[PDB]
């Protein structure tokens, strides 16, 4: 936070609210970048599914909390 | 002092053609005459930036909104230095980036309230930056309106 | 024994009644059984449980399950439930319903407001004022405050 290195690190995080498979990939990339992410329950697809997974059938939830397309895709 | 913005940053052009209608969406009629799978950079020609400057929204506004057009493959260090020094934005004490498509122009009332109250109050107390899609729709619009209200 | 095992195989539907020392209160139990017996979330088959919850005062149950976020509640879906909650004085429930993505501006209509005012309780003071005076609400306010 300025003053070159004399300052201190500027915190950062990402807030997630619903999304789609592309949003899930974005979240995965960000996490692999070691940046905190926050999810909101009840937002919708791509956000509530991860919240439920953290709280915890998994395949059934993946199909339920997200639209039929890409649900069979085990890449999800 | 913007004589160097084109020097550092650059703009990207379709250049090569990858198929009536191509991947880049440019009509076949309007396409460079120089021209399998579209390439993000290999099938792209780099050119100096040309859309830098400030915006003054018609009607109500702050008469100052630094808008810059830059290539996707740009080092964040130069962008951060530009923002911090040239535009006079002080180093944030916090940065929050919002994510999610938020299908539907109108969002849930509970979700809108949660966002505008919690996130914006936290930013106000700490004096942070918020990064969202610069689009006047959905979550970006909600963040913008909440930030303006708290300002 | 085989019958008992078969019953256990589908225990998702069976629900016990907790006497709780003469509780004599199980609306919540009925709602819990109904919600746990559905599972699938399509937002078109959960309206009946919502209407039952409105008819009762089990707001907590509805929030826990019906509005846990799993189901995709639309806008027009909650119009009737909101109207019922307003007519029966369900404050917590109306707050919950409006919270979950209900557009008041697109909801309230002159007919709706007329019905809300017609919901006055029997020979109440407001009923007398309305009869003495479409909602026809401006005149009563001007009479009370003074219109000056
Ligand atoms: Ca049902």
UniProtKB/Swiss-Prot annotation, chain B:
Effect annotated for changing residue 108 to H: In PFHB1B; incomplete right bundle-branch block
Task performed by this protein: Calcium-activated selective cation channel that mediates membrane depolarization. While it is activated by increase in intracellular Ca(2+), it is impermeable to it. Mediates transport of monovalent cations (Na(+) > K(+) > Cs(+) > Li(+)), leading to depolarize the membrane. It thereby plays a central role in cadiomyocytes, neurons from entorhinal cortex, dorsal root and vomeronasal neurons, endocrine pancreas cells, kidney epithelial cells, cochlea hair cells etc.
PTM comment text: Phosphorylation by PKC leads to increase the sensitivity to Ca(2+). Sumoylated. Desumoylated by SENP1.
Tissues in which the protein is found: Widely expressed with a high expression in intestine and prostate. In brain, it is both expressed in whole cerebral arteries and isolated vascular smooth muscle cells. Prominently expressed in Purkinje fibers. Expressed at higher levels in T-helper 2 (Th2) cells as compared to T-helper 1 (Th1) cells. Expressed in keratocytes.
Protein encoded by which gene: TRPM4
Record: disease: Progressive familial heart block 1B: A cardiac bundle branch disorder characterized by progressive alteration of cardiac conduction through the His-Purkinje system, with a pattern of a right bundle-branch block and/or left anterior hemiblock occurring individually or together. It leads to complete atrio-ventricular block causing syncope and sudden death.
Subunit structure: Homotetramer.
Signal sequence bounds: none
Binding site for ATP 2: 148
Protein family: Belongs to the transient receptor (TC 1.A.4) family. LTrpC subfamily. TRPM4 sub-subfamily.
Species assigned in the record: Homo sapiens
Highest taxon listed in the record's lineage: Eukaryota
Protein name per the record: Transient receptor potential cation channel subfamily M member 4
UniProt remark on domains: TRPM4, is a temperature-sensitive ion channel, it adopts distinct conformations at different temperatures, markedly influencing where and how ligands interact with it. Decavanadate (a positive modulator), ATP (an inhibitor) and Ca(2+) bind to different locations of TRPM4 at physiological temperatures or at lower temperatures.
């Amino acid at each position: 936070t300025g003053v070159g290195g004399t300052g201190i690190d500027i915190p950062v995080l990402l807030l997630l609210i619903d999304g789609d498979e592309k949003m899930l990939t974005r979240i995965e990339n960000a996490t692999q970048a070691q940046l905190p992410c926050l999810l909101v329950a009840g937002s919708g697809g791509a956000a509530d599914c991860l919240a439920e997974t953290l709280e915890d059938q998994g395949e059934a939830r993946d199909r339920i909390r997200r639209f039929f397309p890409k649900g069979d895709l085990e890449v999800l | 002092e913007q004589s160097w913005i084109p020097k550092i940053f650059k703009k990207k052009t379709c250049t090569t053609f990858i198929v009536t209608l191509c991947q880049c969406g440019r009509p076949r009629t309007a396409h460079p005459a120089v021209a399998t799978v579209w390439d993000s950079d290999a099938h792209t020609t780099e050119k100096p930036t040309d859309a830098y400057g400030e915006l003054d929204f018609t009607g109500a506004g702050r008469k100052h909104s630094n808008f810059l057009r830059l290539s996707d493959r740009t080092d964040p260090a130069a962008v951060y230095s530009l923002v911090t020094r040239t535009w006079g934005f002080r180093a944030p004490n916090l940065v929050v980036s919002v994510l999610g498509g938020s299908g539907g122009p109108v969002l849930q009332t509970w979700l809108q309230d949660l966002l505008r109250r919690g996130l914006v109050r936290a930013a106000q107390s700490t004096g942070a930056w918020i990064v969202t899609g610069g689009l006047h729709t959905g979550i970006g619009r909600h963040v913008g309106v909440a930030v303006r209200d708290h300002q | 024994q085989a019958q008992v095992e078969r019953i256990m195989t589908r225990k998702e539907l069976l629900t016990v009644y907790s006497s709780e020392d003469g509780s004599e209160e199980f609306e919540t139990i009925v709602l819990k059984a109904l919600v746990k017996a559905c599972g699938s979330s399509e937002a078109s088959a959960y309206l009946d449980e919502l209407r039952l919850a409105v008819a009762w005062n089990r707001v907590d149950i509805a929030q826990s399950e019906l509005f846990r976020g799993d189901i995709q509640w639309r806008s027009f879906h909650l119009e009737a439930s909101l109207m019922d909650a307003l007519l029966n004085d369900r404050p917590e429930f109306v707050r919950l319903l409006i919270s979950h993505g209900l557009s008041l501006g697109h909801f309230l209509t002159p007919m709706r407001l007329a019905q809300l005012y017609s919901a006055a309780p029997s020979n109440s003071l407001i009923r007398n004022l309305l009869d003495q005076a479409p909602p026809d609400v401006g005149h009563v306010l001007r009479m009370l405050l003074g219109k000056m």
